[PDB]
Each structure stands twice: as C-alpha cells, then as structure tokens.
Amino acid sequence: SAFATCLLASVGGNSSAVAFPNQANYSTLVAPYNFDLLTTPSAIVWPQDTQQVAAAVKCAVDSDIKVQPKSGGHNYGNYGSTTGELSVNLDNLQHFSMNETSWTARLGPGNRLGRVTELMYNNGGRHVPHGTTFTVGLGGHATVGGAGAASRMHGLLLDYVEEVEVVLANSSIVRASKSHNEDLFFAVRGAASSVGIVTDFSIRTEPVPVSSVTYSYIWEGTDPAARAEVFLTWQSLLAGGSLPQHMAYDLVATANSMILGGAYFGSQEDFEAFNLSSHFKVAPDVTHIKTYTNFFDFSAAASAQTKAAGIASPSHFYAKSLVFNQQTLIPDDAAEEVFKYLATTKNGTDLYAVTFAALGGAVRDVSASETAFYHRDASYFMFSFGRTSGDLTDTTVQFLDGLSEVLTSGQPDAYYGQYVGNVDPRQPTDEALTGYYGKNLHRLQQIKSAVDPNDVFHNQQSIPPL
Ligand SMILES: *Cc1cc2c(cc1C)nc1c(=O)[nH]c(=O)nc-1n2C[C@H](O)[C@H](O)[C@H](O)COP(=O)(O)OP(=O)(O)OC[C@H]1O[C@@H](n2cnc3c(N)ncnc32)[C@H](O)[C@@H]1O
Ligand SMILES: *[C@@H]1O[C@H](CO)[C@@H](O[C@@H]2O[C@H](CO)[C@@H](O[C@H]3O[C@H](CO[C@H]4O[C@H](CO)[C@@H](O)[C@H](O)[C@@H]4O)[C@@H](O)[C@H](O)[C@@H]3O)[C@H](O)[C@H]2NC(C)=O)[C@H](O)[C@H]1NC(C)=O
Ligand SMILES: *[C@@H]1O[C@H](CO)[C@@H](O[C@@H]2O[C@H](CO)[C@@H](O)[C@H](O)[C@H]2NC(C)=O)[C@H](O)[C@H]1NC(C)=O
Ligand SMILES: *[C@@H]1O[C@H](CO)[C@@H](O[C@@H]2O[C@H](CO)[C@@H](O)[C@H](O)[C@H]2NC(C)=O)[C@H](O)[C@H]1NC(C)=O
Ligand SMILES: *[C@@H]1O[C@H](CO)[C@@H](O)[C@H](O)[C@H]1NC(C)=O
Ligand SMILES: *[C@@H]1O[C@H](CO)[C@@H](O)[C@H](O)[C@H]1NC(C)=O
C-alpha cells in the first residue's frame, strides 16, 4: 500500500523498524498490557528520532489513518496500540543527559521509570517524584500526572517538566514551556495523548532524601466491620491534617488483608516515634519497617513489591479509579457497605486490590487550572484492580462497577474524578472525559481544535475537537 511504502521510508528503509498485520509475530509485537482488550494496529513503527516520528505521522495522515504513540505500553485499554491506527512505538527514544548546572535532565519518552530512576541517581544523586513501577514509560507517565512515594513531598512528575518537544498532527515540530506555546504546554501536562507526540522532556530534579523509610502495617482477616474500621480511621487521620506533609500514605484492601503502607523521608527513629499504628482501634497483626540509605535501592524495592503483589504485570484484568476530596469523603455507613460488598459479591477474580493513595501535600501547590491534571484538591485516589486467571468475564466487570457505585453511595450525584493514568474503557466516553479532565475539559477541547482539528491523535476516550 502507499501507507506501507511511506511508512518504510519514514524509518529509512529499515524493515525491522516497521511491522504490519499479517507479519509473523504481529500480535506479540503489539505487546498488549491488558490481555482482554487485544488490538490490531494498522501498523507499528519504531522511529529513531523526532524527524522519523514526524515522518511517520505524515504517512498516517496521508492515508487517513489516526495515530497513537506508545512509550511503556502500560495503558489499561492498550490505547497506544489502538486498532486500525498507527502505533508509534518510542522504544528507541531513550536518550538521557544531565545539565549539572541546574540538575535538569533531558530525557526521551522511551525511558522506563527504572532507567529514569537509575540515571537520575547516578548523575549527581537526583530524583523526581514519579510512580513506583519500573516498567512504566516516561512518555505516557509524565503526560498524565505521575504520582508516587515522593508526591506529597514534591508534587507530580509533571510539576517538574520544564519543557517538551512535541510532534504535531501536521508533522510540525514545536517546543512548549510555561513561557512558550503555553496552551500546548498545559495540554501536554495531563492530556498529551490527545494533542501530539512528546519526543523529548526537560525535567527538573531534587536531591534524593538522606533517609527513606518504608512501612507496612497488616491486618489479616475477612471481617467487613473490622476492615471498614481500618479504612475509616485511615480516612479520618488523613483528613485531620496531622500527618507529616512529606510522608506517603496508602491503604490496600485485598480479600484477606488490609495493608497500611507508605514512605517516610526521615529517620526510622522519628518515624517509629510518630507511632502511626497507635491511631487504630485494633493493632495490626504485622509491622514491617525498613530504612534505605540508598534511594535507588528504596525505589527498586518499591517496584519489586508491587510486581510481587501480582497487580503490576501484563495480565487479564479490569480496573477502575475514583478521586475523593474533603467534600466527598466516604461516610461511615457507606464504608461499612463497601466492605460488606467486597466480602460477599461474586467477583470472578484470582486476585483483587482496592488501593487508597493519599494525595495532598505538594500536589495541591499547583492549581487545577494550571495544568491539564484537574484533581489538585484530591484527598486520595481509589484504584480498584481485579485480575482473572483466564479471559475476563462480566462477573468481574460487574464486580468493579458495583464497587464504584457503593464507594460513591454516600453522595451519589457529587463530582468524582478519575485518573486518566488508569484508563477505564468500560464506561461512556462522556463519563470518562468528565472524570478524567473535569472543568479543564472545555479548554482542552479548544486546544485540541487549535492543534489537531482533524483528530489525528485519537483513542477511545481522547479529547474531541469542539
Ligand atoms: C501499568 C501500571 C500503571 C501505573 C502504575 C502501575 C502499573 C502496573 N502505577 C502508577 C503509579 O504509581 N502512579 C501513577 O501516576 N501512574 C501509575 N500507573 C499509570 C501510568 O502512569 C499510566 O498508565 C501511564 O500513562 C503509562 O505510560 P506508558 O508510557 O507506560 O503507557 P503507554 O500505554 O505507552 O501510553 C499511555 C497513553 O499516553 C500516550 N503516550 C505515550 N507516550 C506518549 C508520548 N510520548 N507523547 C504523548 N502521549 C504519549 C499513549 O498513546 C496512551 O494514550
Ligand atoms: C473474591 O476475590 C478473591 C480474591 O481474588 C477470590 O479468591 C481467590 O480465588 C481464586 C480462585 O478460587 C484463588 O486462586 C488461586 O488459588 C491458588 C493459591 O494461591 C496462589 O497464588 C499465588 C499467585 O498469586 C501462587 O503463586 C501461590 O502458590 C498461591 O498459593 C492457586 O494455586 C490457584 O492456581 C489460583 O491462582 C485465589 O487464591 C483466591 N485468593 C484469595 C487470597 O483468597 C474469591 O474467590 C472471591 N470471592 C467471591 C465471593 O467471589
Ligand atoms: C533497525 O530498526 C530496529 C528497530 O528500531 C533497530 O533495532 C533496535 O535496536 C536497538 C538498539 O539501538 C535494540 O535495543 C532494540 O532491541 C531494537 N529494536 C527492535 C528490534 O524493535 C535497529 O537498530 C535499526 N537499524 C539501524 C538503525 O540501522
Ligand atoms: C501545524 O499546526 C500548528 C498547530 O496548529 C501550527 O502552529 C500554530 O500556528 C498558529 C498560526 O500561525 C499560531 O498562532 C500558533 O501559535 C501555532 N501553534 C503552535 C505552534 O503550537 C503550524 O503553523 C502548522 N504548520 C503548518 C506548516 O501548517
Ligand atoms: C517470532 O518469535 C519466535 C519466538 O520468539 C522466534 O523464534 C521467531 O524467530 C520469530 N519470527 C520472526 C519471523 O521474527
Ligand atoms: C504506640 O502506641 C501504643 C498505644 O496505641 C502504645 O502501646 C505503644 O507503646 C506506643 N509505642 C511507642 C510510642 O513506641
């Protein structure tokens, strides 16, 4: 086809840097993360640099094909491999350099977070707040938000993004920053996937913490009332404002445990002195506290823990998200109903996790309207994850759907955000857009119309032009 010819030329005739349906191994090359929502892109291309990205986009445009990039491939709907669209695989764009005058790093989108973490540490003992899973790609992560262990302390990853290079739908290459193409910069910091392909990032850094203390307190058992009590305490201690601003603080419910976990940036002695578990009516069954003098080790261990938990690998699953704030905190009775629901509902899973992850702190230092990330006044995220041994069934979809309903049952008609970093393809696109972007939606549609009127950069739940 013209498309195939064009697209081979976009990578300089390197036939290893393009793949088409009907090539051997195509479904493996697509590399699904979610194993249920398998896709067949019209082609996959592996550009070497920005120019080849721009060339490949043009090939799609010339053949009336739409485009998504793929960096780490962690999208929960495999949207970076959308069916019938060009998948621009950015695995080759993994450059890294450190400006030691400012400790600002310049990095390609194909860097996965484990490499980002290693290279920032090695280049002068630096880091930036980001997520905990090492296989997440920077390209899709810095462009949605990027919340992790250091976020209460320092904010989102995208709060450290100072400049980007972006390939636009017409194959123009631009830069964006707070001082230049400010509108594009707004959209890239939380909604890049709808407006262009980020081919380079300049990211400010912080010195690593001197001391990083991981904690984990576990309550074992299946009693819904006991579990609700742990949740309610967890929620009220967060809402009360007594927690140290810098400390990561999360609660994970599984079928047989509640795990209060996080990170404290200070001495183990000072952490232990704070006596976090004393606020709970029932003492945890297990406490694990570990100090890391090396921040790379801390980060590697955090990544290894989520992988070991079974919730961080390509798999069959469904997953949903919600944002809660001081105005939508879950009432006592609804929390009781949440844990009753988890206790008795037929779930179809081989594993589930319901994660409550505190935000606040430095995340709130930036206003909702300053970047495309809307949820700045959030108290916490709720992420639900239901893994299955074989193909997903409606049992598990209904399970998570009904869970979101009971979680919001204290105030069913209030606004609830969703994190666009954890896409939920099994809902109306209208509800998704409203959840993902909130009142930033209108401005994003304006920018979409400005930079991509023909909707080249499209997925199931992308921002539509006006
Ligand atoms: C899989 C996963 C995700 C995850 C997580 C744990 C796991 C196991 N833990 C997270 C956490 O602790 N904190 C957080 O903030 N997010 C966490 N996530 C979610 C992760 O941030 C998102 O899934 C993120 O978007 C993944 O990025 P990645 O780069 O790996 O994924 P992708 O499928 O290739 O892309 C996602 C979407 O963004 C678009 N994209 C990709 N690259 C670009 C560039 N360069 N420019 C513009 N858009 C880009 C894709 O097209 C897709 O729509
Ligand atoms: C609500 O969700 C619960 C959580 O998923 C459901 O329980 C789960 O039920 C499945 C199916 O019965 C069960 O499957 C696994 O059980 C064996 C033991 O677990 C192994 O898991 C690790 C890997 O994760 C494995 O490497 C270890 O050897 C470990 O022993 C497995 O051998 C088997 O192949 C299968 O994977 C889950 O264990 C079970 N989870 C728990 C912790 O209970 C529950 O059924 C559901 N309830 C309702 C009402 O629907
Ligand atoms: C031809 O294209 C392929 C794909 O881009 C290139 O192979 C990759 O090379 C990198 C090293 O630069 C390896 O780490 C990857 O595993 C390869 N990616 C694949 C196979 O998808 C190859 O270098 C290119 N040849 C050139 C540029 O002459
Ligand atoms: C390709 O599209 C971009 C984005 O619409 C165009 O850039 C804009 O051009 C208008 C009018 O000149 C400016 O007001 C905007 O500030 C530009 N936006 C950017 C750069 O983000 C660009 O001109 C188009 N290129 C071609 C050759 O048509
Ligand atoms: C496809 O993958 C298999 C297994 O990984 C490999 O042995 C084979 O050489 C691949 N085929 C092609 C045409 O690359
Ligand atoms: C923490 O609080 C509990 C009471 O809930 C108390 O028994 C324990 O001694 C305290 N631990 C400290 C401060 O080391």
Numbering used by the authors: 5 to 470
Study text:
Sorbicillinoids are yellow secondary metabolites synthesized through an elegant combination of enzymatic and spontaneous biochemical processes. The flavin-dependent monooxygenase SorC and oxidase SorD are crucial in this interplay, enabling the generation of a diverse array of functionally complex sorbicillinoids. SorA and SorB work in tandem to synthesize the hexaketide precursor sorbicillin, while SorC and SorD are involved in the subsequent oxidative processes, including dimerization and oxidation reactions.11,12 Specifically, the monooxygenase SorC catalyzes the oxidative dearomatization of sorbicillin to form (S)-sorbicillinol. The oxidase SorD can then use hydrated sorbicillinol and oxidize it to oxosorbicillinol.
The C-terminally His6-tagged SorD from Penicillium chrysogenum ATCC 48,271 was produced in Aspergillus niger following a CRISPR/Cas9-based expression method. SorD crystallized as a monomer, consistent with size-exclusion chromatography and mass photometry. SorD belongs to the vanillyl-alcohol oxidase/p-cresol methylhydroxylase (VAO/PCMH) family and more specifically to the berberine bridge enzyme (BBE) subfamily. As with other oxidases from the VAO/PCMH family, the general structure of SorD contains two domains (1.55 Å): the N-terminal FAD domain (residues 45–212) and the C-terminal substrate-binding domain (residues 213–435). SorD also comprises a short C-terminal BBE domain (residues 436–468). The structure contains the partial remains of the N-terminal signal peptide (residues 5–22), and five N-glycosylation sites were identified (Asn18, Asn29, Asn174, Asn279, and Asn351). Several members of the BBE subfamily are characterized by (bi)covalent incorporation of the flavin cofactor. This feature was also found in SorD, where the FAD is covalently attached to residue His78. Covalent tethering of the flavin cofactor in BBE-like oxidases allows for a rather open active site that facilitates the entry of such bulky substrates. Moreover, upon testing the thermostability of SorD, we found that the enzyme is more stable under acidic conditions, with the highest melting temperature of 66 °C observed at pH 4.5.
